[PDB]
Amino acid sequence: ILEALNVRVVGTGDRILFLAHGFGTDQSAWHLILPYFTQNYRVVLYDLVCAGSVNPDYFDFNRYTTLDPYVDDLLNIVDSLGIQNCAYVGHSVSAMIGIIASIRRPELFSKLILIGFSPRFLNDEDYHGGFEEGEIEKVFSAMEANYEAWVHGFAPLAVGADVPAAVREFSRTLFNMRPDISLFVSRTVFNSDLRGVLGLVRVPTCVIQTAKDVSVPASVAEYLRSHLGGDTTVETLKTEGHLPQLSAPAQLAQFLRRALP
């Protein structure tokens, strides 16, 4: 599973940093914000199986039916690298994963920093998710429809801010993803939820909040801080974009170090 999801390591030190990209994107996304840390920690970064920059033949439509296996792999990697003390930085998808894992190994996690993280992408009765059965299927709709067309309209939103580069870079990864893959990964996330499970997280987390996320309501940035218990401070980025890792790495960089370790 090592070369499978092309893992890689940079920098040096007693400190072991980790970077897990999320939906669409791939590890390359961290690039624009990696040098800012490589000279202090030992950064690790892989590429989810769904990723486009990864052999699709490793993606099993009978496996990744939910969010569990995706958390297995993550740990499977950690073991093959034999690690006990590190820092996880998960965004969007990989944000949840860190959460799930963060409980299955409250040991292998010192400071859980989450980016554009969310519990349930589907809004419940007394829960505001920002997307309901309609809102989602509408998207799933054109999605299986004209992928080549769907992406053209999504990128601009997630990124949002006027950054033609940090918005174009997202399409790249978004294309390398065999639609089927994306198609699936979507429904799973949206069909996934880990509310209650949150309180269980012991590791002192750290949620990220942007000016306006196209997929994560604002309120939510507070609901998290609500059911965590572990020393979890939810900071905010004075900028725009769903994926700051690229939209404006400048600030994210600096602001990241203010937590980890």
From Swiss-Prot:
Up-regulation conditions: Not regulated by strigolactone, auxin signaling or bud growth status.
Localisation: Cytoplasm; Nucleus
Entry's Gene Ontology cellular component terms: cytoplasm; nucleus
GO BP terms in the entry: cellular response to strigolactone; secondary shoot formation; strigolactone biosynthetic process
Keywords carried by this UniProt record: Cytoplasm, Hydrolase, Nucleus
Outcome of gene disruption: Increased shoot branching. Accumulation of carlactone (CL), carlactonoate (CLA), methyl carlactonoate (MeCLA) and of their derivatives, including 3-hydroxycarlactone (3-HO-CL), 4-hydroxycarlactone (4-HO-CL) and 16-hydroxycarlactone (16-HO-CL). Corresponding hydroxycarlactonoates are also observed, such as 3-hydroxycarlactonoate (3-HO-CLA), 4-hydroxycarlactonoate (4-HO-CLA) and 16-hydroxycarlactonoate (16-HO-CLA), as well as methylated derivatives (11R)-hydroxymethyl carlactonoate (1'-HO-MeCLA), 4-hydroxymethyl carlactonoate (4-HO-MeCLA) and 16-hydroxymethyl carlactonoate (16-HO-MeCLA).
Pfam short name (any one): Abhydrolase_6
A GO MF label: hydrolase activity
Tissues expressed in: Expressed at high levels in rosette and cauline leaves and at lower levels in axillary buds, inflorescences, stems, roots and developing vascular tissue of cotyledons.
Active site: S92, D213, H242
Annotated EC: 3.1.-.-
InterPro entries: AB_hydrolase_1, AB_hydrolase_fold
The keyword Transmembrane helix appears for this protein: no
Family affiliation: Belongs to the AB hydrolase superfamily.
Function: Involved in strigolactone signaling pathway. Does not move long distances acropetally in the plant to regulate shoot branching and is rapidly degraded in the presence of strigolactones. Functions downstream of strigolactone synthesis, as a component of hormone signaling and as an enzyme that participates in the conversion of strigolactones to the bioactive form. Acts probably as a strigolactone receptor.
More about this protein: The initial nucleophilic attack of strigolactones by D14 causes an electron shift, followed by the addition of a water molecule, to lead to the release of the ABC ring product and the formation of a S97-stabilized open lactone intermediate.
Complex formation: Interacts with SMXL6, SMXL7 and SMXL8. The interaction with SMXLs occurs in the presence of (2'R) stereoisomers of strigolactones, but not (2'S) stereoisomers. Interacts with MAX2. Forms a complex with MAX2 and SKP1A/ASK1 in presence of strigolactone.
Entry protein name: Strigolactone esterase D14
Underlying gene: D14
